[PDB]
């Protein structure tokens, strides 16, 4: 039926940098309507791999730099998580990669070289813990930040965050969630064509 709702999430770093997702995010992540998960990597915990796989059928997880104890349960994979993924969701080709391969990290120009390489309309990367949405030349660049608020010196004290992206025909409505001072905030950005 109509539309897709895509969860963009990563850099959990459980158990090394955090033990769990904020409880405040619990029901948001339990919503029935999510039919795609694009995970930027650094899940780090097999238990959390299993949790993310159980959200819905279509769950893509890429390998991050701290992923040392996780196993891809997709049968074709031999337990190996791919370094990058390109997935067609409705009208959009979406690129997914951890981001540590982007040099320098989070560089718009380098990011743009990667969308062109992957030939995608929307590129999703993590690694830096910097929550970000921006458009450049009609392409969309998203970083859902750290879902847990785990520390990285790249973006010290980044809050826990994730994104939920509604795709409907040619319309993108992006909800960006972050947790600050005990309160979950949403910022919406909308894109089309």
TrEMBL record:
Keywords: Protein transport, Transport. GO terms for biological process: protein transport; retrograde transport, endosome to Golgi. It comes from the Eukaryota. It comes from Cryptosporidium parvum (strain Iowa II). CDD domains: MPP_Vps29. Belongs to the VPS29 family. Residues 19-167 form the Calcineurin-like phosphoesterase domain. InterPro entries: Calcineurin-like_PHP_lpxH, Metallo-depent_PP-like, Phosphodiesterase_MJ0936/Vps29, Vps29. GO terms for cellular component: cytoplasmic vesicle; cytosol; retromer complex. Pfam families: Metallophos_2. This is Vacuolar protein sorting-associated protein 29. SUPFAM superfamilies: Metallo-dependent phosphatases (SSF56300).
């Amino acid at each position: 039926d109509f539309g897709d709702l895509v969860l963009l999430i990563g850099d959990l770093k459980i158990p090394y940098g955090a033990k769990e997702l904020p409880s405040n995010f619990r029901e948001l992540l339990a919503t029935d309507k999510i039919n795609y998960v694009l995970c930027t990597g650094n899940v780090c915990s097999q238990e959390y791999v299993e949790m993310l796989k159980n959200i819905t059928k279509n769950v893509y997880i890429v390998s991050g730099d701290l992923d040392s104890a996780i196993f891809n349960p997709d049968p074709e994979s031999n337990g190996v998580f791919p370094e990058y993924v390109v997935v067609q969701i409705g009208e959009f080709k979406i690129g997914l990669m951890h981001g540590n391969q982007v040099l320098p990290w989070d560089d718009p120009g380098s990011l743009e070289q990667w969308q062109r390489r992957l030939d995608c309309d929307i590129l999703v990367t993590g690694h830096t813990h910097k929550l970000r949405v921006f458009e450049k030349n009609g392409k969309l660049f998203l970083n859902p930040g750290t879902a847990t608020g785990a520390f990285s010196a790249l973006t010290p004290d980044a809050p826990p965050s994730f994104m939920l992206m509604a795709l409907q025909g040619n319309k993108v409505v992006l909800y960006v969630y972050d947790l600050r001072d005990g309160k979950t905030n949403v910022a919406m950005s909308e894109f089309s064509k």
